[PDB]
């Protein structure tokens, strides 16, 4: 039986829970090449010699449990909803804050629509109070 254990105590190690400030969302990316899991492609940059691109990222993890899944909406095997948010080739699955897929940009990112709109012949999405004041050549 346990009577022989003589380490029996706690542990401090201490860790992060889920999401990060950039991403409320309970997954890493899973960056192919280092087969590293971090949840911005910034918080990978920070700690390796080499660039994340959120196009190279093809798997990503479910922080609550850790299991390795290819880039999907929810943990299958633990039913963890990674955001509210979903979008495969952005690579992008966070919380919805007002957040827009625009086609001519081809990406979303957290922009209320209601303040920001695409500009066009410009390929950008600027302020309602810019209104589009550019040179737009
Ligand atoms: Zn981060
Ligand atoms: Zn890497
Ligand atoms: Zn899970
Ligand atoms: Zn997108
Ligand atoms: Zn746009
Ligand atoms: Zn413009």
Not at 45 to 50: A, Q, V
Request: hydrophobic fraction near 25%; include cysteine; charged fraction near 30%.
């Amino acid at each position: 039986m346990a009577a022989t254990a003589r380490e029996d105590g706690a542990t401090g190690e201490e860790r992060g829970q889920r999401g990060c400030e950039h991403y409320d969302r309970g997954c890493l990316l899973k960056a192919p090449c280092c087969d590293k899991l971090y949840t911005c492609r910034l918080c990978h940059d920070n700690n390796e010699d080499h660039q994340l691109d959120r196009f190279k990222v093809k798997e990503v993890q479910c922080i609550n449990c850790e299991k390795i899944q290819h880039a999907q909406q929810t943990c299958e095997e633990c039913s963890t909803l990674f955001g509210e948010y979903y979008c495969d080739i952005c690579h992008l699955f966070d919380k919805d804050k007002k957040q827009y897929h625009c086609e001519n940009c081809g990406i979303c990112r957290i922009g209320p629509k209601e303040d920001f709109f695409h500009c066009l012949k410009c390929n950008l999405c600027l302020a309602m109070n810019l209104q589009g004041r550019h040179k737009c050549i």
